[PDB]
Amino acid sequence: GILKTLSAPIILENSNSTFTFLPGGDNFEWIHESIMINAFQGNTLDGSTNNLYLRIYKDNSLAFYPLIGMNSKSTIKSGTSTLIFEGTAEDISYTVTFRLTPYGIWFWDISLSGNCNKADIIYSQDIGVGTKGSVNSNELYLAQYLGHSIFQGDYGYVICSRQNMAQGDLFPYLQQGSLGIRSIAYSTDGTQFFGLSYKKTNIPEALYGDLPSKNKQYELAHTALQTEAFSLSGTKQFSFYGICKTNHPEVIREIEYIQELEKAYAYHESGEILPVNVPTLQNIGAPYASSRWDAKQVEHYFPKRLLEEKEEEALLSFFTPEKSHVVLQDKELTTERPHGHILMTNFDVTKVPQGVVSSTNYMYGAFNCQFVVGNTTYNKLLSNHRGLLNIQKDSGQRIFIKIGDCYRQLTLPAAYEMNVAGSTWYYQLDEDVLIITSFAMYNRPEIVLKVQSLGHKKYDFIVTHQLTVGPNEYENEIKLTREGNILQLSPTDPVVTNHFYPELSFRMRIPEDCTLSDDSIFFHNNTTINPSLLSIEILQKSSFDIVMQGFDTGNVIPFLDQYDYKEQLEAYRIYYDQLVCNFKLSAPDKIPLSAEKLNAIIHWYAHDALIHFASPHGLEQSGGAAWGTRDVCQGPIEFFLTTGHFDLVRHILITLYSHQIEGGFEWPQWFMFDHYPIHQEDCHGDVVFWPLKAISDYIQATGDTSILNELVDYRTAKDALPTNQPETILIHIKRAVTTIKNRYLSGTALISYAGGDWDDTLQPANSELKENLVSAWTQALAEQTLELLCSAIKGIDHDFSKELSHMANDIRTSFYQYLIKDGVIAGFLYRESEEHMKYMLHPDDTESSIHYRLLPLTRSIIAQLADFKLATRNLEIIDEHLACPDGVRLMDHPASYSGGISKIFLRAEQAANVGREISLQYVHAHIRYIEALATMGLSKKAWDALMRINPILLTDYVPNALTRQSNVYFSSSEGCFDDRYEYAKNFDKLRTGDINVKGGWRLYSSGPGIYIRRIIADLLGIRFGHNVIHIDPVVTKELDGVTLQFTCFGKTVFFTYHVDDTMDKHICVKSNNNILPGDNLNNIYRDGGIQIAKDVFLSAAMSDNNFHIYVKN
Ligand SMILES: OC[C@H]1O[C@@H](O[C@@H]2[C@@H](O)[C@H](O)[C@@H](CO)O[C@H]2O)[C@H](O)[C@@H](O)[C@@H]1O
């Protein structure tokens, strides 16, 4: 059985423009040359995101009617470049004429006839303004770089947008406005038009009032324009228009293309314009959102609640003793980002896994998106989640339920409960509760949907599945076979998946009495439009399930007879416990809140980190699949080193070293770690150090110098194929270090910036910057890394170890000689020669608004590179110029923004949106600040810093922080600034907490792993070494009397902290009152902790596993 692909049947063409529509006239793909103008493709059930709304004002009501798309009930005529919608709203007759002209200009001509006292129109248009691949890859990201400029033309507001992130080499542009009627108000983001309330009501919030007339630069690029209100008695006519320019290299300064628009306006197609058949929804109602639960209901279903978050006495969220996090409906309506979750199947934690099964879900009834087996991009069954507000609500697995006459799509539940093993949705129905559960099987490549009516009441359902079977929906045909209640799905030949995973298939077990169709069953006349929407109609049932299996290599297994959530929950609980070494903080009296939060969060962060590693994708950042080179060296390796998963790390390192590129002998920016030969051979300048650092850390932690003699291949730059000319990892290392020697600016050991450093938004804007910039952070990391490498290699190759020492000394010397002035480490040096040198991100750069950088300041402490006095200074700089209530910032002022053109840094100066790194509080870098504080023993700052970025009860800790999902990592914290200009002007609000701040992209980050390492290794102070344990806590008096349960070398022990500032020594460890012998650790900033031998430590733990740690902070 072959499922055909959706093709938009309405195809408008003119010149270099192809605009396609679904049968009801919903935007599908609007292409001008190589630029996609819309942000979202319409789908056959919801239609598209754009519309034109007629509003009617009366004495006792406001009404609002969409005029286009499947939801208008318009009849439709088409020609080759023209679309004509016709219908009535109340007693107003309308016609809307869409004209696609030859000039990369389009019109919506509106004509209204009838009698009414007061009406207006709202124009609504989602805009991508990138290549097709850019749009599909990540709409949110693309929108962040689309800068809007607002002008008054002859007919009120006109919206001009420039895409600042290069598309090919082009910077595309849009203009939108009105003709023959004044646009009296405008908005530029989806959150302004639809609002958060949409996620419940399914009605765009702006429809009830006036547009705000503010440009909000956020992630839903969405233009709206509101006409002046008018009377009708007879006929009135007017237009909206758009203009696309594929390349607008200048910044936007005024309204352009006035004469071209006037010309285009006069354009009409000669041909006939003929009726087309419009399929119409049959017995499909509006979506169904649950009613909200009251306190009695919450109490009944969740009698045991922890860490309750309340606002205005409404319960928003809480955690449970079962390690779940529960979200109530009201919270979702306040959070800009949608609550969500990623399921992932367990794997053998001694090896880099393959074929891991993953699924994503969200609270507003996206039960299962991006079902994948192995590769998260290509080995996929269900389409990705897109957007933020669930306008387009088709993705992945969706559920309709019949209520009265009508099937209604489930959206927002009363409550949403996440566990590491699954998600559960509770919908309140009339005198019933429907429980939906989507969950991972333990030891099996499966996700399971279960639906249960609590009162055993029977309902009718349609479960839809937007199939991919391949990377994307609507690309390729799909093989579908059925045997009884088992479907098997596999990719057809053209699909890339087919080439590298030829045996890949999915299977679905469906309910015994169900009927199978495509979208045909939704329409009055049974017309298939989207043949790859797999629909399962299930009649008069009080429960059912659908079980989804994935087989990347075709190892098909039979379905179990019963699929039990509770058993998986228990198994995943133990799996995660073991992953974190049975981490548990306890105390006899009330545990401190900080410890209570750590116990709550640590397995969530473990889960996040484990996804980042094994099934790499995020919520917003859905497109991943690859390992990032620096990424895998940080979150995953640091997590695994911290918890003793040394075999896994060894394997990760061998896999990583195999991906070093032949010839250049650096690493790609990122690479697939499966059979897809795909990588990005161009890299940032910092990337070469990470694998060097990580291997040194592994060697130091395990003593496993054998990893250096392993024979490991390389990859070719263009093809990403094995070179089949392996060498020892030692020789890999040598070749990588040669590249580093070649980075020296002549006459120095200053490392050239090259492709950039850690901050992916600070890529050099030209080749002079690439050659003559020096990042002080990079310099520091290079020193750190070469010293670590020196030590790891000292026993194996004396001569190379000696050379590494020299190099490190030279780099160190250059760092102190060039990059420090007046006690301040410069962010950057620009050096043409000894005679022409200048600082950036240093107080000496008086022309600049930017005078301090965080990164060099932390790294130089972490590396023990900064002498005690310099380090001390670094901290004072942070305190005075970088520290904010939401954490430490990356620089003391934003990067330049002047309409989107880059002068020094690329994406930092192009981002229209205040978010991500541009927010200047990127959490990962804050976590490094924590590491530096721990290095210095500054326990009160370190623990306060730890809590500032902890999502559990964040709003109580950081009063200007806006609430966000509490059981997932947030990557950034950004001021609620609508544009870069306001951001620059009122930046100081961030220091004082006089602006609100909101959370960034979730889950996918090295942050969760490196946070874990901060908690356990740096602060609680339990670290593993070659047949030794290091105890070096940096704790506050608040942890006095608190105990950590932790499994060490396979033995569970209990570390009880005693914080005694009156002791004559720094640290003392006891078991059964016997003092444990050991050596003191090296630390230039403070007294170090203690190194105890493994044999000694274990011998003590066998007789008494309660270790008492006496420390003086
Ligand atoms: O997706 C937007 C973000 O991309 C980050 O770089 C990603 C990296 O996180 C990922 O591990 C690899 C492999 O999928 O792809 C890179 O493009 C940048 O650091 C961010 O600035 C950007 O927001």
Ligand SMILES: [Ca+2]
């Ligand atoms: Ca105490």
